[model samples]
Target chain A: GYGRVESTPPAFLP
Target chain B: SKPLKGFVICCTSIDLKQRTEISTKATKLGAAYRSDFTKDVTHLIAGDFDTPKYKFAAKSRPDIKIMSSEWIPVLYESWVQGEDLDDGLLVDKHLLPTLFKCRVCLTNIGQPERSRIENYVLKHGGTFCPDLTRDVTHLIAGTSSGRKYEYALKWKINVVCVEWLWQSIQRNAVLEPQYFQL
Candidate 1:
């Protein structure tokens, strides 16, 4: 959980 | 421009229904608007219930004048030019509506519909673009299921400062988006 990044998934899991 | 929404109630007229015309005008011009207009003299001195940093004095009822009254504009012009114009000089009770009235009158003098456009501009210090709107932000309150979650955004226009150069006693007098009530 400590790892960090500049971008992330949109989280549109639907 | 209408005045029934005071007392935190419409007094007699229905809410929003009677405020359409001026509300539309404010929206069309991209200005902030406050419809509930009332004053409690008790709160006047503290700047409570009054626009921030903008203040004036009410000598008494005789000192009270209509928005369009010639004397109102004259006095407003004098105050705008006076030293320390930004100081809260009046109590909210008597000062509230008076300031509200002066909002349109003092600056209306400069509108193209009034005196010579040039003269009005000169009197108001310069030209003010009616279509321009401005905004500032802050945190919001409330949460659901014991967790704070949503982020909300709001916009408003500060007319007093934007409309007249160095003379908006109401700060956002030109338009008062009172608050974005959630």
Candidate 2:
């Protein structure tokens, strides 16, 4: 729960 | 590892170490020496270069063989050449298309955070996700002879290993992508 692995936020993308 | 580092002698009138001086513009005397540049040499003159680990090209004397017999084509064909600016801009034309594909995969498949990943890429001489990392400030590329040079790269987390990157930048490193898995 601490680190985003698979389901990272979309803001991190576009 | 074949000791191409010794080629510095051929570029200088004296010993290799004497020519270690870099100009104020950072350009060295032997700026460009391509493969096969040291194809022929007399035994007498061969003694000038003392460091065995510095010579990678075909030796002057045929009997004195070298262990690192890697071909040059593999590096120029596939790997990234830390090219310079002809006038005002830098170009990665040699490896850009493939690098773009790999970056896309690194983005989608690795699914790494840009902040973290950008920092990671920056550490390995990549910048702003796709630009040359600022840490990779200086590039010591050679064009006339063998393919070996240095680039100064820095990153916050040490997520990237620059030593292996420099080794891989040489004309002989033919390992898989995992070898560069940062």
Please tell me which predicted candidate would have the highest TM-score against the true structure: 2
- How many angstroms is residue B93 displaced in model 2 relative to the true structure, after the best TM-score fit? 23
Scored against the true structure, residue B115 in model 2 reaches a CA lDDT of: 50
TM-score of chain A of 1: 0.27
Q: Write the per-residue lDDT of candidate 1 for residues B1-182, one digit (tens) a residue.
A: 22121212111122344345434432333334334334432121111223331223222212322222122223334444663332332223123332332212122122333334334434433332222112112111221111111211223222222224222332422223233232
lDDT of each: 0.26, 0.26
Candidate 1 Cα errors over 4 Å, as ranges: A1-14, B1-118, B135-154, B158-182
Candidate 2 lDDT, tens digit per residue, B110-156? 23344554454444333332322323322221121111111112221
In angstroms, give how far residue B135 of model 2 lies from its true place: 22
Clashes of each: 7, 17
Is model 1 an incorrect, acceptable, medium or high docking prediction? incorrect
DockQ of 2: 0.07
Q: How much does each candidate deviate at the interface, measured as C-alpha RMSD after superposition?
A: 20.8, 13.2
Q: What is the TM-score of chain B alone in each candidate?
A: 0.18, 0.21
